[PDB]
Ligand binder design. Structure first.
Ligand SMILES: COc1ccc2c3c1O[C@H]1C[C@@H](O)C=C[C@@]31CCN(C)C2
Ligand SMILES: COc1ccc2c3c1O[C@H]1C[C@@H](O)C=C[C@@]31CCN(C)C2
Lengths: 527, 527
């Protein structure tokens, strides 16, 4: 039967799902690891023991234990990222959307969800693979991984909690796709991994980690990169935050063993409640438990690796959105409100700047401020608000990605860079937020195709267009079959991704990025 | 007789000089101090002993001993600043242009020539007061002072050479005008001192020095201010350069006395030849012997004085030219030539930046470079050349003046700010130089009125217009009788000075000046 598939792990029974006046097969909730529950918490993922009988894969699996956003209860604009399924420590599953009739050996795309490494669900509505799978005829897989302390508590030196296990979780799913995507009609030799933000940074972390490279062909990174200031910490800091988390729970901190045992006895929610009390600074765009530069998963510093070419050379298609910072200022910078134009004042701008560059000293803050302030109209609340948006996105997303892109393109075999700057006609967030972090996804996953969603004809068109780029690129290592120029260390060309006639530009945010990538770091270091 | 005047110093016989189809009286070469020759060299000016008989004041006096420019022999564009009279250590004279018939009690304007404190002549063609005096009916006086080591060798602690004597020379002339300008028909209660560059900085130094304030009513400063990076040095540095100068002449450096004696035995030219070998850095826009913050002439640091309001509060009219740096890059930065468009390359830009900010460290140089580089077209030779022009002018002229202006306006009784950005239709210097440092003078002195000079009708008009502003302001403390707005700490309005309809703008070069006046200094200090 088209809905029954036999894998090296056991028989899997999917379900026929309708799509744009048609149907396809979906296998949801396929286990790819042993439940990381019990004494396994914090530990590396064990391979999922094979099962006898048919595994029921017709319904979404539980979501991983994560901090739930309640900043705007009932607000679609925010609840849309919230777990839409019971949360559980038993969440290591994957979902596959396979065209009908079942392919033989077609392109495979593996989606890695974001969420700051502390949240995320593959089961999210915006992650419904059925539209991409059907329209582009690809076998779409969406994995899951442990987020928060559950997947990133890093007590280096210890085997009970080495950290990075959330990354290992992504890899084991990648390992499972390599081993079983064939029986689903997918070509395990043409698998593209892609993710947004935390997923995009994850994707790039797989490009760098020696133990992950062989498990995929090419990669797509959306608003995220491995070298993002928030995507990783040192083992020292990771150890620092792990102990501090134990402190928050009145744990025996006399030994890693003592510490881990305590944390393992705590209910999941117990850890999620104090999870935020461990950051070292008052900051925006920073999360407690993220990947650690352990020396294992990451042989050396990410910078040295990018420099020495120590990483998987292949084709990469990546980009950023126009207003990456907006989402983060709305949640933690004073002066920003969801229901107001959020015009910012000097005092609030200075407060934002401070929250945005936590590691910066005074001279550094002065540097940032001077760089984004129009001293001929410094009291402009819209300029102050916008400049603060740019500061957060440039420093946390746009510039770190421009570094990686320029570092990679030197040894890579093909780079394609886009700048998504289109605002959904039906966005529910305030307009001052603009093209919000994570709002290109719906187009990538072709949501603008479902009439019930109220998108404009142009948006459906842009979605289709973007969706073809992703797939076509996944399939051929090139987005093209109007030509989206290749990015070269020389010309640095990139294109705009919106409902308007393609346009090509060069040096995406050089000025601001030369400051973020070269000057500031040199300054902060000198001082 | 209209050409004979009796002063407290002796009888002075002038000469009737023709002007724009008319005539006026001129008394040139009136001594105002005892010749600073002999053991008097380096010493403070002594009052000129009164003379019996009539002093012949119908011809220009000698020029002070200064380094002569031979960078472009015979080139009018440069020789026009060169001494047009025998140089001599006996150069302390002043010239007065008095209208005919002789006034009774009319406005007095005293011109202080520039020349980096190492050169300058009141007898220069562009300093011919006859046009201003005649047209505006003012009694125009132009003094002289000792430049170079002769007027600025600073061996603090010693009375033989305390330094700043060149400033004292200007003051003694001011003292002589206060005491004798009446017998010439000038009102010693309405005397405005004005000068360009070194003279403009001098002017402001008289506004700050307690012992100079009472000797004049208001002041006009053109492309120069007291706080310019090159207008003064510390006594330590002044002592450093004095000894180094002795070293250059194989002098006994065992004691200030030993040192001064040696330097006094040397012929003037002996000192001018090695004068440049004493700068502490490889630099542009820096001169060996300049005013010292001695604690006498300047009670405290110029910054503290400007901050505490410790200075003469009155009306000031000041401004800058568009391309102040151009003249200095043409003479010392690699890549600049008088006969080429001087398109600069990255390597030469970086070399310019280095020469422009000598005291800057690496981080500082990186700061400057990032601030003036268009990283989307960084190889543009015209942008590189222009950006380097701005760096030199902004840092050495425009920004230091914007500091002073903003500091003064807080305690002053009237500030008028202009931005002269008109290029003489008959300029002989290359066009890449633009509105060159010191090229507003000819308009201020109404040269565009003399047909033989080939100026356009508009330029003669602009000259006349500017000349009325200066005089009208000198006379009333206001340039106006189309209204040139007053500059206020709040609005910071200033106007453009060119042949086009007056336009008012605000915050003259804020961006670049916030960097030069606040950020860079904070950085250089932090690092
Ligand atoms: C660094 O990126 C993020 C940090 C935190 C969050 C998100 C992030 O990226 C956004 C889009 C997508 O990746 C998932 C969640 C995000 C939007 C919802 N908020 C509440 C959580
Ligand atoms: C800091 O200003 C200067 C430093 C050196 C020189 C001049 C300066 O200002 C110029 C205009 C006027 O003030 C007199 C001389 C100048 C033009 C001729 N050169 C050769 C000497």
């Amino acid at each position: 039967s088209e809905l029954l598939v036999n894998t090296k792990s056991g028989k899997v029974m999917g379900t026929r799902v309708p799509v744009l006046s048609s149907h396809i097969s979906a296998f949801l909730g396929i286990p790819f690891a042993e439940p990381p529950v019990g004494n396994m918490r914090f530990r590396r993922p064990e391979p999922k023991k094979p099962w006898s009988g048919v595994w029921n894969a017709s319904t979404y699996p539980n979501n991983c234990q994560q901090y739930v956003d309640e900043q705007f209860p009932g607000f679609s604009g925010s609840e849309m990222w919230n777990p839409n399924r019971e949360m559980s420590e038993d969440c290591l599953y994957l979902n596959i959307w396979v065209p009908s009739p079942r392919p033989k050996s077609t392109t495979v795309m593996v989606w890695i969800y974001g969420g700051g490494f502390y949240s995320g669900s593959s089961t999210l509505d915006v992650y419904n693979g059925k539209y991409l799978a059907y329209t582009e005829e690809v076998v779409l897989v969406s994995l899951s991984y442990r987020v928060g302390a559950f997947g990133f508590l890093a007590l280096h030196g210890s085997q009970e909690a080495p950290g990075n296990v959330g990354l290992l979780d992504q890899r084991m799913a990648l390992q499972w796709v390599h081993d079983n995507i064939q029986f689903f009609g997918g070509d395990p030799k043409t698998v593209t991994i892609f993710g947004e933000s935390a997923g995009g940074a994850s994707v790039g972390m797989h490009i760098l980690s020696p133990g992950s490279r062989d498990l995929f062909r090419r990669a797509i990174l959306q608003s995220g990169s491995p070298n993002c200031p928030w995507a990783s910490v040192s083992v020292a800091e990771g150890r620092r935050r792990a102990v501090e988390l134990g402190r928050n729970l009145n744990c025996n901190l006399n030994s890693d063993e003592e510490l881990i045992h305590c944390l393992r006895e705590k209910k999941p929610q117990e850890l999620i409640d104090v999870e935020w009390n461990v950051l070292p600074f008052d900051s925006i765009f920073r999360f407690s438990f993220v990947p650690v530069i352990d020396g294992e998963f990451f042989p050396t510093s990410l910078e040295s690796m990018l420099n020495s070419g120590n990483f998987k050379k292949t084709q990469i298609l990546l980009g950023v959105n126009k207003d990456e910072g907006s989402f983060f200022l709305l949640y933690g910078a004073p002066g920003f409100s969801k229901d107001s134009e959020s015009k910012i004042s000097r005092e609030d701008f200075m407060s934002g700047v401070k929250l945005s560059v936590p590691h910066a000293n005074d001279l550094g803050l002065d540097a940032v401020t001077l760089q984004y302030t129009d001293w001929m109209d410094d009291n402009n609340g819209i300029k102050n608000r916008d400049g603060l948006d740019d500061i957060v996105g440039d420093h946390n997303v746009i510039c770190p990605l421009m570094h990686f892109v320029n570092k990679y393109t030197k040894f890579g075999n093909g780079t394609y860079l886009y700048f998504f700057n289109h605002r959904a006609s039906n966005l529910v967030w305030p307009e001052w937020m603009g093209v919000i972090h994570g709002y290109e996804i719906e187009f990538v996953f072709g949501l603008p195709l479902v009439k019930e969603l109220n998108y404009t004809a142009e948006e459906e068109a842009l979605s289709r267009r973007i969706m073809h780029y992703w797939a076509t690129f996944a399939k051929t290592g090139n987005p093209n079959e109007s030509k989206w120029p290749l990015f070269t260390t020389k010309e640095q060309k990139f294109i705009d991704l919106n409902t308007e006639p393609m346009k090509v530009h060069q040096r995406l945010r050089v000025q601001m990025c030369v400051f973020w990538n070269q000057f500031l770091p040199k300054l902060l270091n000198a001082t």
